[PDB]
Amino acid sequence: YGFQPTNGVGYQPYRVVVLSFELLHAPATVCGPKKSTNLVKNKCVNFN
Amino acid sequence: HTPINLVRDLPQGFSALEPLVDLPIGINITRFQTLLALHRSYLTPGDS
């Protein structure tokens, strides 16, 4: 591909990353991040 | 891991085995084999 900075938008090289997420029965290794909150004690709270 | 003083057989006694590792390999394994090591002293020539 002849990419040159002068070219147009379509012409410009683009870095593309595709994250395929194979889903199998097997143990899941890649999980999402943890959105957590502060811990409060001595109060009736709904904890997870 | 425990220390023992007994050559002949397993010692009679009860102990638990705590889990060290859980690996996600997910491969079907039918068989296994153990590996041993050789020990050579200074006196020995290196050859096999």
Swiss-Prot record, chain A:
Region (Disordered): 25-47
Effect after changing Q4R: In strain: Omicron/BA.1, Omicron/BA.2, Omicron/BA.2.12.1, Omicron/BA.2.75, Omicron/BA.4, Omicron/BA.5, Omicron/BQ.1.1, Omicron/XBB.1.5, Omicron/EG.5.1
Effect of N7Y: In strain: Alpha/B.1.1.7, Beta/B.1.351, Gamma/P.1, Theta/P.3, Mu/B.1.621, 19B/501Y, Omicron/BA.1, Omicron/BA.2, Omicron/BA.2.12.1, Omicron/BA.2.75, Omicron/BA.4, Omicron/BA.5, Omicron/BQ.1.1, Omicron/XBB.1.5, Omicron/EG.5.1; May enhance affinity to human ACE2 receptor
Superkingdom field: Viruses
Impact noted for substituting Y11H: In strain: Omicron/BA.1, Omicron/BA.2, Omicron/BA.2.12.1, Omicron/BA.2.75, Omicron/BA.4, Omicron/BA.5, Omicron/BQ.1.1, Omicron/XBB.1.5, Omicron/EG.5.1
Quaternary structure, from the entry: Binds to host ACE2. RBD also interacts with the N-linked glycan on 'Asn-90' of ACE2. Cleavage of S generates a polybasic C-terminal sequence on S1 that binds to host Neuropilin-1 (NRP1) and Neuropilin-2 (NRP2) receptors. Interacts with host integrin alpha-5/beta-1 (ITGA5:ITGB1) and with ACE2 in complex with integrin alpha-5/beta-1 (ITGA5:ITGB1). May interact via cytoplasmic c-terminus with M protein. May interact (via N-terminus) with host bilirubin and biliverdin, thereby preventing antibody binding to the SARS-CoV-2 spike NTD via an allosteric mechanism.
Chain's role: Attaches the virion to the cell membrane by interacting with host receptor, initiating the infection. The major receptor is host ACE2. When S2/S2' has been cleaved, binding to the receptor triggers direct fusion at the cell membrane. When S2/S2' has not been cleaved, binding to the receptor results in internalization of the virus by endocytosis using host TFRC and GRM2 and leading to fusion of the virion membrane with the host endosomal membrane. Alternatively, may use NRP1/NRP2 and integrin as entry receptors.
Protein name: Spike protein S1
Organism: Severe acute respiratory syndrome coronavirus 2
From Swiss-Prot, chain B:
Impact when changing D9G: In strain: Beta/B.1.351
Phenotype when changing D47G: In strain: Iota/B.1.526
Residues bearing carbohydrate: N28
Known function: Attaches the virion to the cell membrane by interacting with host receptor, initiating the infection. The major receptor is host ACE2. When S2/S2' has been cleaved, binding to the receptor triggers direct fusion at the cell membrane. When S2/S2' has not been cleaved, binding to the receptor results in internalization of the virus by endocytosis using host TFRC and GRM2 and leading to fusion of the virion membrane with the host endosomal membrane. Alternatively, may use NRP1/NRP2 and integrin as entry receptors.
Record's subunit section: Binds to host ACE2. RBD also interacts with the N-linked glycan on 'Asn-90' of ACE2. Cleavage of S generates a polybasic C-terminal sequence on S1 that binds to host Neuropilin-1 (NRP1) and Neuropilin-2 (NRP2) receptors. Interacts with host integrin alpha-5/beta-1 (ITGA5:ITGB1) and with ACE2 in complex with integrin alpha-5/beta-1 (ITGA5:ITGB1). May interact via cytoplasmic c-terminus with M protein. May interact (via N-terminus) with host bilirubin and biliverdin, thereby preventing antibody binding to the SARS-CoV-2 spike NTD via an allosteric mechanism.
Name listed for the protein in its UniProt record: Spike protein S1
Organism of derivation: Severe acute respiratory syndrome coronavirus 2
Gene name for this UniProt entry: S
